[PDB]
Symmetry: C3
Subunit: 572 residues, 3 copies
C-alpha cells in the first residue's frame, strides 16, 4: 500500500531528492559553524545503527524466517550507503581516516555474520562480539569526525593527562589492535612506517615511563614496603600457576562416560548339526528383568564363599544385571522337511561320527543410549558321541511318545557377561569349572493335530527346574557404556600433553628478558634528556631525532604529529 502510494505520485519520488542533494551541498557549505556538529551526529547515527543491528541480533533469538534474514541484509545495504554520503564529506582529504579505517571495520564483520549463522544457529553469540568491536571504534570515531578540528596529536595528550588510569586503557587494547592500527598510520607514510613502526613502539614505552613518573611520584615512598600490595600480586601469581597446573588437572579427567546397558532383546537357539534348529526364542520386555537390590543380595549370598566371584559381582550395580526369563517352548514350529527329519533320526541312531549340539545366545543393545557394538554373542557346543545314551534318547523322541524326554548335561551357561565388545562369554568367575558348571537341560518334542503328520515344536527346560519350569533364567551382566572414549590412541594423547607442556614452554620461553633494550630504556626515564641525549646519540634513536630533521621537508600538519614527539623528546 505504502509502496504503491509512492509509485502513484511522480512528484513525491523526484524533485525532492534533488532538493535534498542541494541542501547537503549548500547546507554543508552555508552551515558556517555546524558541519562539525553534523559529523558528530553522523557518528552518533552509526553507533545507534550498530546497536539496532547489535540489539536486533541478540533480541530476535532462536531462528528467524529465512526471508527475514534477507530483509536484514537489505537493511544492511542501507547502512553501507548513507555512510557513503558523509563518506566523502568529512571525509577523505579532510580526514579519510573516517570512511577509511572505519569502512574496513565493517565489511569483514558483515561477511562473518552471514557465515556464522549457517543452518546450525548460535552464530549471534559469536556474532554479537563483532558488533561491540565496531561500536568501540565508533565512539572514538564520533569525536574523530572533526579530524581537522580533532587534532590527532591532542587525543593522545589527553590520555597522558589520564596517566595511570589513562595508561591502563592503552594496555588494554594490546598489540593486535595496534598492529592493525599502526598500518593505517603506516599507510599514509608506508616507507617511513617501517622506520615509523619502531618509533611507535618506542613512543609507547616512553608514554609508559611518563605514566609511572606521574602518579608514581605521589605514590612513591622511601624505604617503605606494604604487605598488602605484595600479597595481591603474589596470590594472583599462585592462582595463575594453579590454573596452569590446575588446567592440566582439570582436563586430565575432562573426559568420562557411564550409562547402564541392558540387552533389549535376548535371542537363543538350540541346533543339532546342520538340521533346522530345534528351538528358538527371543525375550524382550518385560521378560528381561533388571536386578532389584533383593536379587543382588541373593546373588551375593549364593557366591559369598568365593572371593573371585564376589570380585566379579562387585563390579556391577543391580541396574547392570538382568535375568532374561527365556520361555522354553520354541517360538516357532519346527520347519524340517520330511527327508531331513528321517536323515536326522538315522544319523542320531546310526551315525559313526560325532554330531554337534549348539546353544547360542545373542544380546541386542540400544546404541541410542551409548556404546558402539549393537550385538554381543557367543555359543556353547557339545559333541554327542556315536551310540551315546543321550544321542539315542534324543532320536527316540522323534517317535512321538509325549511322556518321553532326554537330559543333556552341561548345556546352559546361566551366567553370561555382555561387555562393550561383540563377544559375550560365560562368566568363568561364577562358573570356574567352565562347562562342568553349566546346567543340564531336559528336551521334549511337542506334537499337535493335524489330521499321522502333525505340527511339531521343541520344548526345553532346566533339568532341575522347580517353580517355573517354563522359564530358563539367564543372568546377564552388562558393562556400562560411554558416548566418547576421548584420548583414543595413547601416543596422540601423550603428544597433546607434551604440546601443551612443550607449546606452553615455547610461549613461556619466548617472552624472555630484554636486558639490552631495557638498559637503554631504563636510563632515559631516570636519565635527563640531555644526559639521555648523550646517551641517546649512540643508539639509533638519536639518529631518529636527526630524521626529525627531515620533518622540515614534510608538511607541517604531518610535521606536527612528528612535532609532538619533540615535545615528548623535551619531556624525555
Amino acid at each position: 500500500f505504502f509502496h504503491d502510494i509512492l509509485h502513484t505520485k511522480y512528484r513525491a519520488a523526484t524533485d525532492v531528492y534533488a532538493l535534498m542533494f542541494l541542501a547537503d551541498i549548500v547546507d554543508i557549505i552555508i552551515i558556517i559553524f555546524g558541519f562539525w556538529a553534523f559529523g558528530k551526529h553522523s557518528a552518533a547515527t552509526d553507533i545507534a545503527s550498530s546497536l539496532s543491528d547489535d540489539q536486533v541480533p541478540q533480541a530476535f533469538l532462536f531462528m528467524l524466517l529465512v526471508q527475514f534474514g534477507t530483509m536484514v541484509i537489505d537493511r544492511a545495504l542501507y547502512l553501507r550507503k548513507t555512510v557513503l554520503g558523509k563518506l566523502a564529506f568529512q571525509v577523505v582529504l579532510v580526514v579519510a581516516i573516517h570512511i577509511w579505517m572505519f569502512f574496513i571495520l565493517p565489511a569483514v564483520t558483515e561477511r562473518m555474520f552471514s557465515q556464522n549463522a549457517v543452518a546450525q544457529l548460535w552464530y549471534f553469540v559469536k556474532c554479537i562480539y563483532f558488533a561491540l568491536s565496531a561500536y568501540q571504534i565508533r565512539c572514538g570515531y564520533p569525536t574523530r569526525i572533526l579530524g581537522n578540528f580533532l587534532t590527532k596529536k591532542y587525543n593522545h595528550l589527553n590520555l597522558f593527562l589520564f596517566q595511570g588510569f589513562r595508561l591502563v586503557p592503552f594496555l588494554v587494547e594490546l598489540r593486535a589492535v595496534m598492529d592493525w592500527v599502526w598500518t593505517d598510520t603506516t599507510l599514509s607514510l608506508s616507507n617511513w612506517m617501517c622506520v615509523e613502526d619502531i618509533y611507535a613502539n618506542i613512543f609507547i614505552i616512553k608514554c609508559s615511563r611518563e605514566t609511572e613518573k606521574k602518579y608514581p611520584q605521589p605514590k612513591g615512598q622511601k624505604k617503605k614496603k606494604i604487605v598488602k600490595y605484595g600479597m595481591g600480586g603474589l596470590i594472583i601469581l599462585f592462582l595463575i600457576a594453579i590454573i596452569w597446573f590446575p588446567l592440566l588437572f582439570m582436563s586430565l579427567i575432562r573426559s568420562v562416560v557411564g550409562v547402564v546397558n541392558q540387552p533389549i532383546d535376548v535371542t537363543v537357539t538350540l541346533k543339532l548339526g546342520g538340521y533346522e534348529p530345534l528351538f528358538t526364542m527371543s525375550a524382550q520386555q518385560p521378560s528381561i528383568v533388571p536386578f532389584t537390590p533383593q536379587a543382588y543380595e541373593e546373588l551375593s549370598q549364593q557366591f559369598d564363599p568365593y572371593p573371585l566371584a564376589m570380585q566379579f559381582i562387585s563390579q556391577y550395580s543391580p541396574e547392570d544385571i538382568v535375568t532374561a526369563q527365556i520361555e522354553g517352548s520354541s517360538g516357532a514350529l519346527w520347519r524340517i522337511s520330511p527327508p531331513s527329519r528321517a536323515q536326522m533320526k538315522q544319523e542320531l541312531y546310526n551315525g559313526t561320527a560325532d554330531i554337534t549340539l549348539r546353544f547360542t545366545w545373542n544380546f541386542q543393545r540400544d546404541l541410542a543410549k551409548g556404546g558402539t557394538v549393537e550385538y554381543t554373542n557367543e555359543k556353547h557346543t557339545l559333541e554327542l558321541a556315536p551310540n551315546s545314551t543321550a544321542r539315542r534318547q534324543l532320536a527316540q523322541l522323534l517317535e512321538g511318545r509325549p511322556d518321553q524326554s532326554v537330559v543333556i548335561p552341561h548345556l546352559f551357561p546361566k551366567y553370561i557377561r555382555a561387555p562393550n565388545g561383540p563377544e559375550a562369554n560365560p562368566v568363568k568367575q561364577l562358573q570356574p569349572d567352565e562347562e562342568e558348571d553349566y546346567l543340564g537341560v531336559r528336551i521334549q518334542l511337542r506334537r499337535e493335530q493335524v489330521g499321522s503328520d502333525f505340527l511339531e515344536w521343541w520344548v526345553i527346560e532346566l533339568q532341575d527346574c522347580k517353580a517355573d519350569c517354563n522359564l530358563l533364567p539367564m543372568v546377564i551382566f552388562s558393562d556400562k557404556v560411554s558416548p566418547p572414549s576421548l584420548g583414543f590412541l595413547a601416543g596422540y594423547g601423550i603428544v597433546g600433553l607434551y604440546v601443551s607442556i612443550v607449546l606452553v614452554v615455547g610461549k613461556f620461553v619466548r617472552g624472555f628478558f630484554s636486558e639490552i633494550s631495557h638498559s637503554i630504556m631504563f636510563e632515559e626515564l631516570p636519565c635527563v634528556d640531555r644526559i639521555l641525549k648523550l646517551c641517546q646519540d649512540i643508539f639509533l634513536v638519536r639518529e631518529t631525532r636527526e630524521l626529525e630533521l627531515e620533518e622540515e621537508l614534510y608538511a607541517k600538519l604531518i610535521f606536527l604529529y612528528r612535532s609532538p614527539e619533540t615535545m615528548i623528546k623535551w619531556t624525555r
Copy 2:
C-alpha cells in the same frame, strides 16, 4: 641376451675397467683446460639425472609394477656411485664442501620417496617437490665444481651487482635454507661459527642496506609521493587481513554433508502377548514409494489448517518422504502351537489380567550412503482389558468362521519419523492427540484346508480402507544424513579457534619490533663507516672487527672470505 654376451667374453668385462681408471687418473693430470670443464659436465650430468628421475616420477603416473619400483631403486644405486664416485675430483680436499655438498641433499630425499609412495600412492606429487629442491642446489653446484676456480666470495659479490633484483633472490631462500647452509660454513669453523652465525646475520642486513642504497638512489625522490605504489601495498594488506579474517569465515565450509535417507526395508509386526506373532511383513522395493510433488502437495493440503503440522512438513523435501505400502496379509504362516493356540483362546476369553497387543515398526537404512545408525524403530502397545468386546471378538476369530473380523481402534500410527538416531516416533505434530489419532485396524484369520486345524495366517487392513484394502500405507519422514559431523564436542571446536586466534596471536606477537637492533643498524647505513666505526666501537661489532685481527693467524684463503667483510666494512 645382452647380459650373456658380456658374460661370454672375459676381455670385454675386464682390462677395459683398468684402462678407464687410468684415463680418469690422467684426466686429473691433463690437467688444465679440462678438469674444470669436467666438473661442470659432472654437475650437468647430475642435473640431467635428477630430471630423469624427476621426469620419471611424474611421467609414469598411476601405479607401477612392484618390480619396476625395485629396478628404479637399483638405478638410484647407480646415481649414488657416480656422485661419490667422481667425488674424488672436486673434491675431498679442494671442492670439499662442493663434493659432499649435495651428498647430504640426496640421502634424505631418497628415504622419503620410498616412504612416501607406501601402498596408497600419490607420493610423487609430494615426491616431485623433493626433486626440484635437489635440482636448485645442483644449478648452483655446477658452477660450484671449480670451487678453487669458483671463489666463494666472488659469487656473493655478483649478487651485489644484481642489487635489488639480486636482493629479492636472497630474500626468497629464507631463514630455513640459510640455517641448514650456515651450518656447513659453521662445520668448517664450528667454534667461530657460533661467533660466525651472528656475523652472517649481520652481513645479510648489511647486504640488504647496500641494495637499498643502490637502485634506491636512482629511485629516490625528495618530497615526492606516489599513490599507486602505496595502493598496491595497502590493497594487498587489506587482502591479507581478509584472508586472515576470511580464512576463519572460510572454515565454516566444512559444516556440510546432506543426503536423502529412505528405509530400504520397512518391517512391521503385530503380536498378542507372548504368543507367536499374528502378523509380520517386510516391505522393500518398489513397495517403498518416494513422495512425488503431487503426494507432497496432497499432504500439504491435508494439513494446511494446522501451522505446527505444516512447520514439520516443510522441513522435508518430497525425496525425504516415502509411503511404505505394507501388504496386510502376513508374510508367514502362523507357527503357534495348538496348545499355545488353546492357551491364547482361553486367555482372551477367561483371563483376568490385561493382555498386550503390540504393533512394531523397524526401518532399515543404507549406511553406504551416509549416516551411522542402520535401524530405527519403535512400537505402539494397547492393553486389551479382560472381558472387553475387542478381546472376546478376537478370541471368536479362532473358531474359524471366515466372514468374521475384529476392529482394534487406534492401532496404526500412519505418520512416523525415521530420524538419524535409533528411535522412530510417530509424528506428534501430525497426530497431536497421539494414540487417539492412530488408525483403526480390522483383523481377520485366514484358516485354510488341509486334511481339524487349517494352515493359518492373519490378515490386517485399515478399518477405513477404500481403494486398496490390501495395503496399509505408512508415511515415513526421514531426516537427511551427512558423512561427517566435523566439530564433534563443542569444547574441542572452541579450543581450535582459540588456538587459531591464540596461536595466531602468538605468531603475530612474536615478530614484535626490534628497536634496539634497528637503531644500531639504521645509523650505519646512513652513517659513514668512520662515524659508524666510532658508533661501531661500543657495539660488539667493533670487537668483531678486532677479531678480524685473528684473521691474521687464519689461513689466507679462509682469510679472504673474512677479507671480503673488510671490503664490506670499507663499503660500510
Copy 3:
C-alpha cells in the same frame, strides 16, 4: 590393638608431646653447632621420604586397593606436617624462602599424582618423573638449610670453580627452571626484579664467558685444527637433520592396520515377486571354507588365459578367499498361505506382467577383528516374462509331481567380492559378460505327508552340478581391513604436515641471530673491564653499575649478592 594401647593410657598420649615441644625449643637454641646439623638432617629426611613415596609408587606396581591409596594420602598428610612445625618453627626464620620455594615444589605434584592415576592407571610412570624433580631440589636444599651459613653467593662461585664441567650443569637446567626460580629471587625484590631479570640473564652469559676463558686457555691452540672434534659436531648435525627429515618424516609411522576378513555367515535367499521366499539358507562354520594354496592354484589355472581376471585374483591371498558351501535344500519350510499359493500359481500361469525372481546374498563379518561395516550385500534379479517357458514350468512344479524341475538360466553369480563397504558386487573381472556369466539353477519343490497337502520346501542346485549337487559353492573375495585409517580427510593431513613444516619453520626462524646483543657481549670478554667500561657506559649495563650505587641503601646482606656482581664486574 596398638591404637587401643595408646588410648588405654592417658600419660603416654600427653605430657610427652609437651616435653618434645620443649626439647625442640631447647633444641633450636643451646649448643653452638647442632641446629645447622639438624637442618641438614631435616633435608636428608625429606629426600628419604620422597624416595619412599617415589620408591613406593614404582614399587607397588599394577593396581592397589582403593583404601590403600587413601592410606598413602593419609601418609602424605604426615609428610606435609612434620614440615608444618619446621615450616616456620624449624625454622627458616632467616632463609624463610626455605619453606618457600620448597613448599611450592610439592603441592602441585601431589595434586597431579592423584589426578594422574585416575581409573586407567599407568599414572606412576608419568607420576614417577614428578618425584625425581622434587628430589633434585632437595639435594640442593639440604646444603640450603643453613642458608645464613650457606651463603647464596658462595654456591654460585663454586660452580665457577667447576668451570666447563660446572658450565654444563647450568646449561642443563635450562630456561624453564630458571624462569620459575628467577621469580623467587624476584619475589624478594620484585620491583628491582623486572630490572633484576635482565641482570640475571646478563650474569648467565657473563658466567658462560668466564667458563670459556678458563678451560679454554689450556685447551686453546694457535692455528691448530682437529678433524675429530669437527666430525662429532658435524656428524651429529647430519643426524639431527636426518631425524628432522627422518624424524619429522616419522609421520607415516601411522599407516597400516589390516589382516583378513572372512564372512562368519553367508545368507542367501531366492524369492519370487512378493510371495513368501522359496529358499533361504545361512552358511556358517565349517561351511565357509578358506582357500588352501591348492584352491588358489586351481582358481589361477582356471583364469590363467585372462590378464584382467588374474590381476583381480593376485590382489588376494588364499586366506582372503572362501568358498561358501551353500546347502541347496531350503533351511525353512515354505510358509506361504494356500491362496498366496493359489495366487502365485495363477500369476505364474496367467499373469500379463513380468514377475521378479530375486537371488540375494548378505555376508556378515566380525567387527571385533577390524573393519567398520558388519554386513555387505547385493542381489541379482531376473524378470520372468509372461507365458515364458521357465515361468510356466515353475508354476507346474506346484502340482506336486516330484520328478519335475525347472532350470533358470543365469541366476547364480559364483564369484562375489565382499569389500570393506556395504555393497558386495559379483566380480566383473571374473564374469565379464555379467549376467550371461552367472550359473543356471535347477529348482524343485519337495513335499511329503502326513498320510493332498504336506509340508513344502524348495530345493535348488546348480544346473551343471556333478559331484556335490547338494552344494552351491559361492566364491567370496574379501578385502582386508585395518583398525585405523589415520589421515582421514586429505586437507587435515596436509595441514598437519604444513604445520609440522610451518610450525617447524617458525621455531627454526625464531632463534635467528642476535647480532646486536652479541657485539656488546663479545667485546667485553675479549675486552678489558676498563675498556669494557668505556664500552660499558654507552649501554644500559654501565647504568646498571650506577644502580649498583643504590646498593648503598639496600641492606648489606642483600647488598652482598649485588656485591658478588662487582667481583664479577672486577672479573669482567
